[PDB]
Coordinates of N, CA and C in Angstrom, one line a residue:
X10 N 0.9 -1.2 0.0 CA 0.0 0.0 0.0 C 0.9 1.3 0.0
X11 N 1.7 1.1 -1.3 CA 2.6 2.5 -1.1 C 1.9 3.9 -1.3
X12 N 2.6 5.1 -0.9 CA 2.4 6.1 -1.3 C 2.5 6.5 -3.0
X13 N 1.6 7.4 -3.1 CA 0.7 7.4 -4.4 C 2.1 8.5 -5.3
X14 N 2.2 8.6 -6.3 CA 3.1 9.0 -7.4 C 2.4 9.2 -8.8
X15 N 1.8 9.9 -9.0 CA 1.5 9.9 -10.5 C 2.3 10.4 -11.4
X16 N 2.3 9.8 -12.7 CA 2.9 10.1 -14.3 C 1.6 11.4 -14.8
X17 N 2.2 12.4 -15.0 CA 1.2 13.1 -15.8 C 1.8 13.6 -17.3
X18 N 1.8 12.6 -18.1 CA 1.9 13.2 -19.7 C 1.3 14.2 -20.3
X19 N 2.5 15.3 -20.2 CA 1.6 16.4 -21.0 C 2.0 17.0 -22.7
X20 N 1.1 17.3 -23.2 CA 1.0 17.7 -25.1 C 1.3 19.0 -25.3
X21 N 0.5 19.7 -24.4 CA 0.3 20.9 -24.0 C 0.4 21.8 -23.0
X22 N 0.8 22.8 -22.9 CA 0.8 23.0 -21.3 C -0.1 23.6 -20.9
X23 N -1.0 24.5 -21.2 CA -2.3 24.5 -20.7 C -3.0 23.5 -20.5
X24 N -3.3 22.4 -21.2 CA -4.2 21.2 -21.4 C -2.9 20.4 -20.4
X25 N -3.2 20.7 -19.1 CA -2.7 20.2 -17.7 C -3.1 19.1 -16.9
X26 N -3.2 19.0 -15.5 CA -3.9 18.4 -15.2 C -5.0 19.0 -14.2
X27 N -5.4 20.3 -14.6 CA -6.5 20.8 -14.2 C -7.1 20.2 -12.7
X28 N -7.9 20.4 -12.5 CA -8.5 19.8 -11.4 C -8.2 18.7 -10.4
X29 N -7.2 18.0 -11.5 CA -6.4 16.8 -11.0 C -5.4 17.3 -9.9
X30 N -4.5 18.3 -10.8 CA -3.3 19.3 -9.7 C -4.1 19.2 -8.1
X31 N -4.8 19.9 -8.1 CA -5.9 20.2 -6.8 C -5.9 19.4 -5.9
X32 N -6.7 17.7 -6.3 CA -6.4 16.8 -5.8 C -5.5 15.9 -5.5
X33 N -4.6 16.6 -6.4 CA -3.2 15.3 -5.9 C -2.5 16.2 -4.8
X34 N -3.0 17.6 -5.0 CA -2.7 18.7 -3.5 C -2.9 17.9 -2.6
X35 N -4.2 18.1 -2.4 CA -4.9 17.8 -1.6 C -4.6 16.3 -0.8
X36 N -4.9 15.3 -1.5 CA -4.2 14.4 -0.7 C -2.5 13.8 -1.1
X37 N -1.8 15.0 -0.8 CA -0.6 14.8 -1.0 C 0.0 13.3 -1.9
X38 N -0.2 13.3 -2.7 CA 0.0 12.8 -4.1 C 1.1 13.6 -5.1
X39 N 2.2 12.8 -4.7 CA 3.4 13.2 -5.6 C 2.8 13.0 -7.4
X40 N 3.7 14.0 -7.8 CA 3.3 13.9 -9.4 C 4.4 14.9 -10.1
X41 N 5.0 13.9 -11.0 CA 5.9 14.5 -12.5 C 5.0 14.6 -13.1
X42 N 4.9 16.0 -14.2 CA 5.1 16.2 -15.2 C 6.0 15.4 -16.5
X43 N 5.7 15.0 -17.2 CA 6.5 14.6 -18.6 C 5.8 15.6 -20.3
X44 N 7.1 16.4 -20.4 CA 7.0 17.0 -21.3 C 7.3 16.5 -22.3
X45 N 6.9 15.4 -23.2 CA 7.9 15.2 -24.3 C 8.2 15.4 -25.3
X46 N 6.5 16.9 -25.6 CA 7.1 17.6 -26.9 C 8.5 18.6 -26.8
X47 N 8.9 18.4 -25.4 CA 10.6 19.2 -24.9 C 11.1 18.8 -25.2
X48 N 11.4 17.0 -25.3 CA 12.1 16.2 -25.7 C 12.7 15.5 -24.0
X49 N 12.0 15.4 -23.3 CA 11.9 14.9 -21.8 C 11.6 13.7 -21.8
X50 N 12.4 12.4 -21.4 CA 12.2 11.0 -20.8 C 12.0 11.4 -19.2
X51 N 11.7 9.5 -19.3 CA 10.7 9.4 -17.6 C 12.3 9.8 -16.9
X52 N 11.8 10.1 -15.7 CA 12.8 10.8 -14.7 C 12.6 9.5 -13.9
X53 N 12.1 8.5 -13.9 CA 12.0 7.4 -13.0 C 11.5 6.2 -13.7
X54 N 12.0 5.6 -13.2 CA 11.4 4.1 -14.1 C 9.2 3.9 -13.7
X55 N 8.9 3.6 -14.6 CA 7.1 3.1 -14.5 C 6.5 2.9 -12.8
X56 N 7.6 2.1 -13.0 CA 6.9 1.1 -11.6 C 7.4 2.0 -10.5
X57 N 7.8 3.1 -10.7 CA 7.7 4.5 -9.6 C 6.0 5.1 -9.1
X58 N 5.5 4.8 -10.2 CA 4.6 5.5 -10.5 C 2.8 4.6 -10.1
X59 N 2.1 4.8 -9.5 CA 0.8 4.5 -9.1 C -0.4 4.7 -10.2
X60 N -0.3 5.8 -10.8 CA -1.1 5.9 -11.8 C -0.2 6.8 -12.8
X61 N -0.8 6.7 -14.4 CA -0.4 7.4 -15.1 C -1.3 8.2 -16.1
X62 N -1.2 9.8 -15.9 CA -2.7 10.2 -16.9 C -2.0 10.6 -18.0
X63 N -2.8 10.3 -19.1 CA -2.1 10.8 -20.5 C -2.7 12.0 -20.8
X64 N -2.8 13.0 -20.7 CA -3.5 14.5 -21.3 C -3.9 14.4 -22.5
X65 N -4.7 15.6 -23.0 CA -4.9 15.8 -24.5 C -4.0 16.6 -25.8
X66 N -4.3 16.9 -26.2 CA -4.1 17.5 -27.5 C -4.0 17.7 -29.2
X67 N -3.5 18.5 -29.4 CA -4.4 18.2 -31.1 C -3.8 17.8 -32.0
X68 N -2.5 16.8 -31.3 CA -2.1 16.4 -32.3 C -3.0 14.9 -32.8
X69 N -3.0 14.1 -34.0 CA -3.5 13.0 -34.3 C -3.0 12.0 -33.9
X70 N -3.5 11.0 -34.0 CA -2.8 9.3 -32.8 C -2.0 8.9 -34.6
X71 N -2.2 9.6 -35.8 CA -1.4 8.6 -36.5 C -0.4 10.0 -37.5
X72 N -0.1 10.6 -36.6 CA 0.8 11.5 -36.5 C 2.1 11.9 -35.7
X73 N 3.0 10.3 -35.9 CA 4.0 10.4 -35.4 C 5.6 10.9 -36.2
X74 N 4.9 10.7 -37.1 CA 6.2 11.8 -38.5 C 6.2 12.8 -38.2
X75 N 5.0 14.1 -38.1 CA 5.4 15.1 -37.7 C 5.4 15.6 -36.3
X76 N 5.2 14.9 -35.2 CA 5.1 14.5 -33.9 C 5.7 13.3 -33.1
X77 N 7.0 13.3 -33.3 CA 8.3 12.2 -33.0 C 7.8 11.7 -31.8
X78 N 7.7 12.6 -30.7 CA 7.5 12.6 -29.6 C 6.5 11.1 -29.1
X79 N 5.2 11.1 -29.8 CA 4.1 9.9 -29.7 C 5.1 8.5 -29.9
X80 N 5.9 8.9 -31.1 CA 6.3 7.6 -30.8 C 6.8 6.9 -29.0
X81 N 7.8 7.8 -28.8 CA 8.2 7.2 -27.3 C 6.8 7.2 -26.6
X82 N 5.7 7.8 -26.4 CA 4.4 7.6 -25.7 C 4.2 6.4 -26.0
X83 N 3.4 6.1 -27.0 CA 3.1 5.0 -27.8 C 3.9 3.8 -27.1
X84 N 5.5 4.0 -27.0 CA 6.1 2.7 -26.3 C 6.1 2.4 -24.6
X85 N 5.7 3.6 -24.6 CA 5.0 4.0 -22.3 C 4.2 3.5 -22.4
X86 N 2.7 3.7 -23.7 CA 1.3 3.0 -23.4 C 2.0 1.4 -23.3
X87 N 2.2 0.8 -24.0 CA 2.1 -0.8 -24.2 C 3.3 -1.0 -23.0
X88 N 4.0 -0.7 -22.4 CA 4.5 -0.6 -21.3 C 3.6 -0.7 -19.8
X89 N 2.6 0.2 -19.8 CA 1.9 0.4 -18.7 C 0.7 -0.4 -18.8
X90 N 0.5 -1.0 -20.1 CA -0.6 -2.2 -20.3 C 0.3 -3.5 -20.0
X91 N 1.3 -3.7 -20.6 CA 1.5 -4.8 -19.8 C 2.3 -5.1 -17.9
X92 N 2.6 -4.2 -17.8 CA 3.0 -4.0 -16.4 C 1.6 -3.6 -15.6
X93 N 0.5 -3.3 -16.3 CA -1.1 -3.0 -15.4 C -0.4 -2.4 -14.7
X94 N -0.3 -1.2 -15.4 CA -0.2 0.1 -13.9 C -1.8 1.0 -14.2
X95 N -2.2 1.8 -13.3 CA -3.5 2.2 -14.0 C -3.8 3.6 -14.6
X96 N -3.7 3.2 -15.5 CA -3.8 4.6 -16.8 C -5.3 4.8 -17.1
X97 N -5.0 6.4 -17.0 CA -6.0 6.9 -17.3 C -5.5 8.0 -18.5
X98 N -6.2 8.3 -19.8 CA -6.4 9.0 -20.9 C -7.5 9.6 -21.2
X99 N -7.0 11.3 -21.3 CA -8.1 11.6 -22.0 C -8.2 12.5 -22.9
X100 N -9.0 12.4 -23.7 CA -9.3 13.2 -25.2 C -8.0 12.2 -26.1
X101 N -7.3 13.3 -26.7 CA -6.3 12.4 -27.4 C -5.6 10.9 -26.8
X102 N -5.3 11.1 -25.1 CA -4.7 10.1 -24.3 C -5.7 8.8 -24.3
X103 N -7.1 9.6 -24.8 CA -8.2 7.9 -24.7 C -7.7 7.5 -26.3
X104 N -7.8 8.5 -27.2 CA -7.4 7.7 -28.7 C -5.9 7.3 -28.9
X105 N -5.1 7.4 -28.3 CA -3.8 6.8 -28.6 C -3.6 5.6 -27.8
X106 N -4.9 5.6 -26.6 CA -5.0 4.0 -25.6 C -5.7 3.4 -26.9
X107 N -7.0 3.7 -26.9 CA -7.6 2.9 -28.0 C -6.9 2.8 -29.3
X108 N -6.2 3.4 -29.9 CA -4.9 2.8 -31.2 C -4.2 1.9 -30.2
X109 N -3.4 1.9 -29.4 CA -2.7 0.9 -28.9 C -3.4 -0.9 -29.0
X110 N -4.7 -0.5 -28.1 CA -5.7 -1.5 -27.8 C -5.9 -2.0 -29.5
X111 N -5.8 -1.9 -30.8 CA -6.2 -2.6 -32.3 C -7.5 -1.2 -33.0
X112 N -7.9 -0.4 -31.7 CA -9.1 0.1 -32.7 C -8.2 1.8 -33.3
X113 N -9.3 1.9 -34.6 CA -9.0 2.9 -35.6 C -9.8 4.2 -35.1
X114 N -9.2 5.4 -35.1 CA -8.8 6.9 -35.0 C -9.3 7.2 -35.7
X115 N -10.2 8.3 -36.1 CA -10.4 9.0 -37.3 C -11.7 10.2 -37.2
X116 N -11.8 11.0 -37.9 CA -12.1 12.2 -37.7 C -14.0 11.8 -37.4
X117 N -14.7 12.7 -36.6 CA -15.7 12.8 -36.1 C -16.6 13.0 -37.5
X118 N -17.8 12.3 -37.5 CA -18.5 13.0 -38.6 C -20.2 13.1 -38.4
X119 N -20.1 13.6 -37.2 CA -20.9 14.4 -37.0 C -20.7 15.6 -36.0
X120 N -19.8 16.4 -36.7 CA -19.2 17.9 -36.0 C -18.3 17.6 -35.1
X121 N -18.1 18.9 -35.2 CA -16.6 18.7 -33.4 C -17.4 19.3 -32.1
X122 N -17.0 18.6 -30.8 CA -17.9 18.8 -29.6 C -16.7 19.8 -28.7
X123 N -17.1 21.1 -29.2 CA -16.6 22.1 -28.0 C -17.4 22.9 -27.5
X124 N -17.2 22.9 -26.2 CA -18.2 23.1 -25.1 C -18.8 21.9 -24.3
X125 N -20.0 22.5 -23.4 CA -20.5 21.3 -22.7 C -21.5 20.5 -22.9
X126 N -21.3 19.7 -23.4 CA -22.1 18.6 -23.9 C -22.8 17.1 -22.7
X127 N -23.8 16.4 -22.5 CA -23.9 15.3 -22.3 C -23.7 13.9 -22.9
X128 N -23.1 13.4 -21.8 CA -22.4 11.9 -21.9 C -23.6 11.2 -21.2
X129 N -23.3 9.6 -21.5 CA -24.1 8.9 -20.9 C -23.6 7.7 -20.5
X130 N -23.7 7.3 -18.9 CA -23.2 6.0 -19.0 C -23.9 4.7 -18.9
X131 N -23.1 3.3 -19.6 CA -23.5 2.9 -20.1 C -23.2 1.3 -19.6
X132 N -22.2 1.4 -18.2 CA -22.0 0.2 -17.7 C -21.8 0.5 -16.1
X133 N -21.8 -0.5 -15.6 CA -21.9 -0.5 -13.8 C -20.3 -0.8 -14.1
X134 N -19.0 -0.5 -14.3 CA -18.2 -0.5 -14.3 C -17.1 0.3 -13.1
X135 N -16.8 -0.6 -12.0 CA -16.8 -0.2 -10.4 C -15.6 1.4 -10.4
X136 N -14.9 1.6 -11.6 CA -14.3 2.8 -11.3 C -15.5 4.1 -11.4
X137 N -16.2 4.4 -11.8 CA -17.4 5.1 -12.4 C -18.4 4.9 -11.5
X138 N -18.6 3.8 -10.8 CA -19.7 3.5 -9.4 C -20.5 4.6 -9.4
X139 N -19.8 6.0 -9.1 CA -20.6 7.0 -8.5 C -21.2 8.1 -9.5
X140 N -20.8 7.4 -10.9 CA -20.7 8.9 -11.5 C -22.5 8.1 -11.9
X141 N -23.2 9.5 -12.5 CA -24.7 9.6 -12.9 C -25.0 9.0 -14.1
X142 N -26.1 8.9 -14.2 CA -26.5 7.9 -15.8 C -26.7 9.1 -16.8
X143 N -26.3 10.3 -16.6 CA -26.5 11.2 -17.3 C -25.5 12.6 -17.2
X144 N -24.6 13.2 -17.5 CA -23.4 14.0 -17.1 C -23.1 14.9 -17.9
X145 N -23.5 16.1 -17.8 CA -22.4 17.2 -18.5 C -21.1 17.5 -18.2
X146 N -20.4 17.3 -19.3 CA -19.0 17.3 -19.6 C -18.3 18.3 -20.7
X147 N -17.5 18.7 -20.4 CA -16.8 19.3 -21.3 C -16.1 18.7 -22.6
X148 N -16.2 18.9 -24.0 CA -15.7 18.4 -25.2 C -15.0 19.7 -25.6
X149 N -13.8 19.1 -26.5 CA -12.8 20.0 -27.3 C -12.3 18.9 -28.2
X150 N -13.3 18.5 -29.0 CA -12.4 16.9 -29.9 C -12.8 16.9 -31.2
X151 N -11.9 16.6 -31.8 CA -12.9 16.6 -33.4 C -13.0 15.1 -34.3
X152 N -12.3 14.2 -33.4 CA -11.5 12.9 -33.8 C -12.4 11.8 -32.6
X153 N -13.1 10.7 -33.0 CA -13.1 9.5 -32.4 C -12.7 8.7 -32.7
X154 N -13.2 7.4 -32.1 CA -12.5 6.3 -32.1 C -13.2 4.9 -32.1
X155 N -13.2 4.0 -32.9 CA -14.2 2.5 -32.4 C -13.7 2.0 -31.0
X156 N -14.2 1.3 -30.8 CA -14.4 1.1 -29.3 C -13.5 -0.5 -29.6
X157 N -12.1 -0.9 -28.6 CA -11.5 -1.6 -29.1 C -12.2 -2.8 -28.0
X158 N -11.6 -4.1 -29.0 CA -12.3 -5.6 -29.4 C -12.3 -5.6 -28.0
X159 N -11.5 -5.9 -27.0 CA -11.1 -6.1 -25.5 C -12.2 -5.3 -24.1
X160 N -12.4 -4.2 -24.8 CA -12.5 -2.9 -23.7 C -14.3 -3.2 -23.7
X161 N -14.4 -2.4 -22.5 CA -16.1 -2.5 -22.2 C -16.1 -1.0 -22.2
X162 N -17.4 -0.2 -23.3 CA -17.9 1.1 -23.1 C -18.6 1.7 -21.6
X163 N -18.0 2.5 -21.4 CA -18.4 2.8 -20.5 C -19.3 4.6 -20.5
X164 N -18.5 4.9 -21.7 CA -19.6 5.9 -21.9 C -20.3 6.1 -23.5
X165 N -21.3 6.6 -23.8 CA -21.6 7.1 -25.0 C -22.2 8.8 -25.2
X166 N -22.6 8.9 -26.2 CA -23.6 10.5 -26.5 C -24.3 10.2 -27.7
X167 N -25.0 11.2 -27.6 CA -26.0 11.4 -28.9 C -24.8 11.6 -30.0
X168 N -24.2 12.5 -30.0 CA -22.8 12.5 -31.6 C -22.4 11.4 -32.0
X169 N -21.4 10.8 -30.8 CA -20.8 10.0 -30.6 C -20.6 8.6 -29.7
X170 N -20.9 7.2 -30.4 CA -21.3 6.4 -29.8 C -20.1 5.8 -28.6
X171 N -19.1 6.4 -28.7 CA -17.4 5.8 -28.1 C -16.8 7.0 -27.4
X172 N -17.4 7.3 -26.1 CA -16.8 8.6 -25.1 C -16.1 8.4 -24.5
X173 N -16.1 6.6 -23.6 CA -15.1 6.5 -22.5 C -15.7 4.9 -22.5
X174 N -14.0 4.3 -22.2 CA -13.8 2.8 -22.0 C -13.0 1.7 -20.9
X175 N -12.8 1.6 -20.9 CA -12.2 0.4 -19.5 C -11.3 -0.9 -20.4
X176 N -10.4 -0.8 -19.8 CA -9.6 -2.0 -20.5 C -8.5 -2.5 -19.2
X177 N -9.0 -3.1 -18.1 CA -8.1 -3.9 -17.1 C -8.2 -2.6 -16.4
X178 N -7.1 -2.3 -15.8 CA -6.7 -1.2 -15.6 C -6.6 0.5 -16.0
X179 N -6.7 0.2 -16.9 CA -6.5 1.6 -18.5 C -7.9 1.9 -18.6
X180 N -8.3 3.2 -18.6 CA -9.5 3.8 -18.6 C -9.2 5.0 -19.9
X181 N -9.8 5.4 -21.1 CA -10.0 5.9 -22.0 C -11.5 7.0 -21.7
X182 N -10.5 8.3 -21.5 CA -12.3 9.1 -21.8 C -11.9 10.4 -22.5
X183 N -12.9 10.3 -23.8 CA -12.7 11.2 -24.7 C -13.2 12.5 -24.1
X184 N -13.7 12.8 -22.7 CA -14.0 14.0 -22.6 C -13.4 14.9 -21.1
X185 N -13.5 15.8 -20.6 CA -13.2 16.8 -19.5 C -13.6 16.2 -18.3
X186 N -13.6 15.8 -16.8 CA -14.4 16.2 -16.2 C -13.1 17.1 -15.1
X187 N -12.2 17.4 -15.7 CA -10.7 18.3 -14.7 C -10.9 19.8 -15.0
X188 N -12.0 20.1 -16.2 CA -11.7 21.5 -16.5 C -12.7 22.4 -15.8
X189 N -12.4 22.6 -14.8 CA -13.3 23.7 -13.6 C -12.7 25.4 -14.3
X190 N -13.7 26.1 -13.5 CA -13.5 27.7 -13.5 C -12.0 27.9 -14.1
X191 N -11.0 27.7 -12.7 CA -10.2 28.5 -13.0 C -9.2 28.2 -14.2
X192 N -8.9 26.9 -14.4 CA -9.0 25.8 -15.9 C -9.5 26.6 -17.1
X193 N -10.6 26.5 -17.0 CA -11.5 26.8 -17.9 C -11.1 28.6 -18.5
X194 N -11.1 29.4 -17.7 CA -10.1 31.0 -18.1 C -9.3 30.7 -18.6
X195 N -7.9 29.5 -18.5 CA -6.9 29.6 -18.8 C -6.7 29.1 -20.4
X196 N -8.0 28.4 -20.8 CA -8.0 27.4 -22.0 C -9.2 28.6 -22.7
X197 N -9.7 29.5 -22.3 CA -10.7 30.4 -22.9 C -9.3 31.5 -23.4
X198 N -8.8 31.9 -22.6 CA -7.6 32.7 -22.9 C -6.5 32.0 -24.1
X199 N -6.2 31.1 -23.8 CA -5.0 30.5 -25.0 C -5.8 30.3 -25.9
X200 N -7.1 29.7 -26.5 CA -7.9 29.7 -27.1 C -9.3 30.7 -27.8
X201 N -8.5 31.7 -27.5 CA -9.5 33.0 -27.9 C -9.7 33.2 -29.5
X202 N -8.9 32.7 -30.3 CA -8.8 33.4 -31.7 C -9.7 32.1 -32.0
X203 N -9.7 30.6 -31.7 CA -10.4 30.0 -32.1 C -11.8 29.6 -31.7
X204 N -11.6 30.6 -30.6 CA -13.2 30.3 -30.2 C -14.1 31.4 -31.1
X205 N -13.2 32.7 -31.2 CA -13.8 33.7 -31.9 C -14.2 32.9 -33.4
X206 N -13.3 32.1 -33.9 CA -13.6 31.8 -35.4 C -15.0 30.9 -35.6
X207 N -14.9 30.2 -34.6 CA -16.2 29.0 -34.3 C -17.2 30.1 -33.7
X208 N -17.6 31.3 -33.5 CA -18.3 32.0 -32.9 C -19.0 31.0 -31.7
X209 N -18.3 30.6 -31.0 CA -18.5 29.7 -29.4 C -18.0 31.1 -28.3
X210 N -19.0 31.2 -27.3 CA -19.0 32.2 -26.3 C -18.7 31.7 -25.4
X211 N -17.4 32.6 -25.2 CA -16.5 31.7 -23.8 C -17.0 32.2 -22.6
X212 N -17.6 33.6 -22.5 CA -18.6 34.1 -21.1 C -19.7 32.2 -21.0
X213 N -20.0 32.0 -21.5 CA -21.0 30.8 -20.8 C -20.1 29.5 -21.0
X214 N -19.0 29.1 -21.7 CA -18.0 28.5 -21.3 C -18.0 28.4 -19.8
X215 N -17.4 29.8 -19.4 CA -16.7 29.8 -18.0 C -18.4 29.8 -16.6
X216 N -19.3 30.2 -17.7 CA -19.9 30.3 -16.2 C -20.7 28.9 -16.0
X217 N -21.1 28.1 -17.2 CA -21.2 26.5 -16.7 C -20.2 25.7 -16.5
X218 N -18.8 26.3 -16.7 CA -17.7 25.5 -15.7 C -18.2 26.1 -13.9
X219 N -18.2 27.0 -13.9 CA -18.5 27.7 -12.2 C -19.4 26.3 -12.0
X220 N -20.9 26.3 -12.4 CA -21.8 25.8 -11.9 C -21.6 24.2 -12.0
X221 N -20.7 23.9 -12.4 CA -20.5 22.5 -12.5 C -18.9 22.1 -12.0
X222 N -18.4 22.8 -11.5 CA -17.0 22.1 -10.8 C -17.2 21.5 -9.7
X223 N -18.3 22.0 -9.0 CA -18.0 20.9 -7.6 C -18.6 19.4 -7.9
X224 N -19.6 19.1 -8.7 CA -20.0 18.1 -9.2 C -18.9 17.0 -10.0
X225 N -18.3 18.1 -10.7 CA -17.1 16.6 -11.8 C -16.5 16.8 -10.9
X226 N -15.6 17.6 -9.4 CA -14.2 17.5 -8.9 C -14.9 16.2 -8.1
X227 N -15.5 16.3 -7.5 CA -16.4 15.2 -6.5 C -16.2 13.9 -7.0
X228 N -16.7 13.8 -8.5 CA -17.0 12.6 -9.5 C -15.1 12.0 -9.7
X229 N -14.1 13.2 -10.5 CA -13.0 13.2 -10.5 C -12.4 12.6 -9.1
X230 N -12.3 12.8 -8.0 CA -11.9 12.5 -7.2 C -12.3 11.1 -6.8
X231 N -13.6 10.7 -6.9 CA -14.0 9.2 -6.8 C -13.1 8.1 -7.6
X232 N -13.1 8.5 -8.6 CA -12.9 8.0 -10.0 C -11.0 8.0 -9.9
X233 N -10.7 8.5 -9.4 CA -8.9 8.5 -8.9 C -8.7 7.8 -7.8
X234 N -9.6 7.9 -6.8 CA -9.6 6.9 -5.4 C -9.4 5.6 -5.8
X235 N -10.5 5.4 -6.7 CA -10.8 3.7 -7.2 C -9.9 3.3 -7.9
X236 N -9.5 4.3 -9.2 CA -8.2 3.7 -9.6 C -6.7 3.4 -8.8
X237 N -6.2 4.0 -7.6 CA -5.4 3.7 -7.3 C -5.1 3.2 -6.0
X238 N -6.7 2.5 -5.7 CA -6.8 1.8 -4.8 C -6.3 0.5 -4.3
X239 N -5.6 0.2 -3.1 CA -5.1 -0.7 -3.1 C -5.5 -1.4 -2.0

């Protein structure tokens, strides 16, 4: 029952670990950063590590020519699947689990989901226990994914039938529940020119992040308990 250590893979440095930071405060939960569009390897071997989240970003899961960096990820994911350490991914970090896992990546075709959207869940699957049969969530994705041969769905939406999945250990979720208020400014800010171009209003961005952070940190926090429960 060791003390807890998380891997936090990041793409982006805004696209952080949001709400997660908070809680690994909170219950004093060590955590690296891994930058490795810097060109940064692990600072400790895997099995340092209790959990590992893979963050988002825009780059594509079959975009490692112009994105070197995925390759080394790519060789962490099948690393942490066979060592079953407990990975969690999300947005890009669920589609580069799901490529790993046999299933195919490829662009959304029914629009891109930015803003807050409902998810649905769709199995009694014991990390999720607590979360609702019904959940507003934050999307920024334009890319899904089939739901690989192995894994049990664990979420869906009206867009998109493949939101979040379960594989052993390895949890895949194509959507937010880390992006609270003060998150939410930071990604309204680095993202202004394209929220302006999509004419998407970041004033109600931020204020149904307000009204919904204690709900996903609550959910978030369950949902990290169970994974690195021992």
């Amino acid at each position: 029952h060791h003390h807890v250590r998380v891997l936090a893979i990041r793409h982006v440095e805004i696209e952080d670990l949001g709400m997660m930071e908070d809680i690994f405060r909170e219950k004093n939960w060590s955590f690296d950063y891994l930058d490795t569009p810097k060109g940064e390897k692990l600072e400790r071997p895997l099995e340092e590590y209790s959990l590992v989240v893979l963050l988002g970003g825009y780059m594509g899961a079959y975009e490692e020519e112009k994105y070197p960096f995925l390759k080394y990820e790519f060789q962490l994911i099948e690393e942490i699947l066979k060592k079953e350490i407990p990975f969690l991914g999300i947005c890009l970090g669920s589609q580069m689990l799901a490529k790993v896992l046999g299933a195919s990546v490829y662009r959304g075709k029914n629009g891109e989901e930015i803003g807050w959207y409902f998810v649905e869940k769709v199995s009694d699957n014991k990390f999720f226990r607590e979360f609702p049969d019904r959940l507003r969530v934050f999307q920024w994705h334009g890319d899904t994914f089939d739901l690989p041969r192995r894994a049990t769905r664990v979420f869906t939406s009206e867009k998109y039938e493949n939101q979040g999945f379960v594989y052993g250990k390895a949890v895949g979720l194509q959507f937010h529940i880390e992006v609270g208020a003060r998150t939410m400014k930071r990604w309204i800010e680095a993202y202004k020119d394209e929220l302006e171009k999509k004419k998407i209003d970041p004033r109600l961005l931020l204020e149904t992040a307000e009204r919904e952070e204690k709900v996903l940190k609550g959910l978030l926090r369950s949902l990290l308990e169970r994974m690195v429960e021992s």
